[PDB]
Amino acid sequence: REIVHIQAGQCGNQIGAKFWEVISDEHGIDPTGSYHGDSDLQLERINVYYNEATGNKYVPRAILVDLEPGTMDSVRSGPFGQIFRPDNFVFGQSGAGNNWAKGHYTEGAELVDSVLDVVRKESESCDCLQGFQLTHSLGGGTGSGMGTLLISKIREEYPDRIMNTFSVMPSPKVSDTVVEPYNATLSVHQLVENTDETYCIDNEALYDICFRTLKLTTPTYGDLNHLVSATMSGVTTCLRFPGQLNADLRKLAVNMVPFPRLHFFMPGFAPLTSRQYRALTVPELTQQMFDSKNMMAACDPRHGRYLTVAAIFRGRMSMKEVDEQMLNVQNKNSSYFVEWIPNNVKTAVCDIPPRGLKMSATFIGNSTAIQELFKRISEQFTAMFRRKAFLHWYTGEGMDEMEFTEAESNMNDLVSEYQQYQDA
Amino acid sequence: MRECISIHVGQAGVQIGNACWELYCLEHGIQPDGQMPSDKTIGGGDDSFNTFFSETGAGKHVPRAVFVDLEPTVIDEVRTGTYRQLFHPEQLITGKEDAANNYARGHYTIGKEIIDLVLDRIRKLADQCTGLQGFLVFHSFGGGTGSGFTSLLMERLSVDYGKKSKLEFSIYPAPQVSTAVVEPYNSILTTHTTLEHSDCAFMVDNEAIYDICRRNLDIERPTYTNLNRLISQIVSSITASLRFDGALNVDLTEFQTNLVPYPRIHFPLATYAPVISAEKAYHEQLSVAEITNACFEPANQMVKCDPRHGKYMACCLLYRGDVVPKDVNAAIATIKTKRSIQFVDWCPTGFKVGINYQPPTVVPGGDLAKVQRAVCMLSNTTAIAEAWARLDHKFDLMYAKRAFVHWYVGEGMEEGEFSEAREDMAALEKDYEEVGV
């Protein structure tokens, strides 16, 4: 059950690069690709993310995509840059200019076929391909514009494969350009149609966690990506180690997505205060895991209801106390869980904890409060589109105002759809 | 001697099968390498245990079983397990990608690809039988393979073996060990399509087995290994009459005759006792009256329900150990005057008793302690319908919103089958209603 990883754009590659550094450490793979672990649990499902090349080395099944060489050059020279397959570095020279149109219609078009050739070369080698996972942002041009283009074409060639993404949402707090709401609204429509699972990672939430919780006065992208690495490692634990709950991408989608369009999850991590010597008790993990302060989407869970929830505990701990602590959370706040989906909370436990922690808990929530994120992007979108401001950047690439009206309309539908089940 | 073929489908069916055949070998004295020293007839057998084991010229006793799973990981553990030498490769059938807890995926999409292979492999063992009685099908309700592919196999078996009997050992879904939210969907889907093809089905609620392990075995967080070792005991005493000399439940046809007066109502309740922890320093061995009385305690039933608020259609008592008929009738006499046991008007109030002198066998190093006498009651009580109501209610809660339905339509199924299955369960609940009051 192989997974094909793709990271596109500046954000997608910087986050994707850190992700491979976290799990490579967990699986005992050095920057050279040589395994140096001390537990067979590190290698039992190593094939999900790593290809075993000649010499008993492990090559990440990762494709590095970007319309600029800059960020990818940093990855190639970064800590684990050497471990990535050289041929899998597919990049252009022009860039995308934080423009969804350039990444999806013009610049990205030139390069997309080159990426699909590498994807095809990886898929053909897989014994049983689960699907793909994409790391990217939605505020830029390459990861947002070209990322969604890749997904549309990947789905056309692999329609019976699971499409999973880690999508960073733009926020004025951590903003590069004013056109970020435009790019995000355009991308969300693609994701609503061509993905099965999307982890909504809000840069606003990441910033607040660094500022309020981690006590970081001047948060950087490196500090935000630290949280994303820890979260990405958690949500994929059940995929990278032996287990029975949500062990693959499809069974995860079957437990988490009751309606095809409502597949946007709120990730959470605990202990949040990461980047410390006293480990937490099982009751403490459960409490923080469900605490909105540990949510990565910047949505108040109490403003909605949980359709489905997937918990993942890591470390040597009392499974009994875990079971009774999970039951305590549900029976203590049962009103926040829809009563028309019985037993919508599934819990998994993994022996191997993350690096630096003796115990941790990862949270994956499909809450109707996620609409707060889309409603927020929609308001920022309409604020500019109502005056057609900054549209010339996009009409200059062949886009018509109509396509913006449709995207705006599609997301408001998504919001209303989330509002439907929050009242049923 | 008439042979019986066992079929284990999905993870639950395969792992439970692995626990049962381990217990069979221990009871019959068959070594992991297939040899059976106590067997003097080499290469040929007309004995009671030959209904479950075939014999080779080399003296190996091969189970008349076939394992099938749409995923290779579970059956691979059997290919490399302690009893690898027991099965031959043709008996272990595995796919590449499983049903993802999706009934439609296991019945239509993936099931259609492997259905002819499994039937062909089953035909291999059938041709090696002189008088095949039928099949014993082990599977889960919640799994996509156990639910989806089993209903397709049960259909085909009725087409290729219309005369043979088919018995089920079904694992009822319990959230404490559940792996999918849509297990209520799969349970009702597989019951609707399998109902007309199963002659007698023994349901096992993981909730009941789970709690029994916590209370009677002192296991904080029981695992599948704990559950299956206990489930195999119940299965062993149920099939013991087919593997040993005796006169009660000597063939699969007798199960339907003794426990199922109505075809649709073919879900007998199973109660087992005693379940003693092997960790206890010493325990006072229970008597015939004590273990028999425990058969009417819901805390010992394979499905939690209150038989007092229902009516019986048939009862069978299966004793293994130091038990004589005199002690049984004495226990039955006192129990009648101190318990609510109401039969249906057209059925006689009585008990078909069976006693095998060999005490129950326990896996060395397991959790169950060795006892001097044990009993397994098979009672066809309308009270078991409580389990149907539970499932159907969860089904109604989700289906009202169409939650998760798209996963099934996307595999080729139609919403109509959802309503059909539910309507069939609605009829099944009424059947229990009128028979029960």
Add this chain to the structure above:
Amino acid sequence: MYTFVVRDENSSVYAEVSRLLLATGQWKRLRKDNPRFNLMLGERNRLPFGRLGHEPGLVQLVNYYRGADKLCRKASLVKLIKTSPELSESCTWFPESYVIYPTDEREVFLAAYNRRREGREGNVWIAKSSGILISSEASELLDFIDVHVIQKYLEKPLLLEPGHRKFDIRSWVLVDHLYNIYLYREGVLRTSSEPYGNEMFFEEFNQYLMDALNTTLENSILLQIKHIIRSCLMCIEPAISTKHLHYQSFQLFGFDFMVDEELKVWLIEVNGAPACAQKLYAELCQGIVDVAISSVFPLASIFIKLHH
């Protein structure tokens, strides 16, 4: 923080119980169809007992005993007394009754009818079901039925003076999850102001028995009442006990008695969902929480325990 649901809005008694629970600060009321509850104030008909006791980590309690209707339905109550050996024909506290289906003990009912027809004894009966007709001729009451029940009519009831009135006694009994039988220390007499709010409590009725009959309510009546309550509940105990069940039950019962001129107590019927007297709602409803609820769900006597 315990949770509970309310599935019977017409329950005047448990409408007060659910009020006290919330007012304790340790009970949260959920939606009536929310499964993650500790206590259910279930509906009066078709309570889903089959779905109780299947929530991991939830000790679930319900305010009804499944199978108790056998004692509360007049038709089944007669069958219980005439069939159960514990009661049988030896019990001298139940009026001679027969079950008659409206087109069955009709043939046997007439057998004893001719016995009193032959004799000069009173032959007045009453016909009722779960609209009543009191008639001396068996034909007038049978035509009224067309399932009902016909039983002997107490022709010599104890009359309260002054007034020459007729009355009946209502006793509230509580049975907890352990099957302790708690008889509410307070009772009420429902009187007919017409010669043979109409509520006479025990304090007054007791004084009358002392000033009029030179006896006490305890000796002349309450002993037999406690005997009848104990006998009825101890007979059906094996059928409804939740001692080793995955869910626990309790229930408040309403026993109605009759006292004849000989100071003999008779059982009329049992009510599985009775209503308390306005003056006694507070004290009793508080006792339900103390004995039946807090005993199972602890927090941060008005009853008479009937031993057995």
Add this chain to the structure above:
Amino acid sequence: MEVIELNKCTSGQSFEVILKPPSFRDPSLEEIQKKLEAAEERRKYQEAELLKHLAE
């Protein structure tokens, strides 16, 4: 009570104790192969509509 049909042997024995007397077609392979192929058609059609949507 009443004990009847008592059968004994070396392995054990069986019988039946009575306490009270009583108060007193499967689808063909064609039809199966038909529905299995009907489901595969609905899949191919749904997939064709997706590939038609992506072509647009």
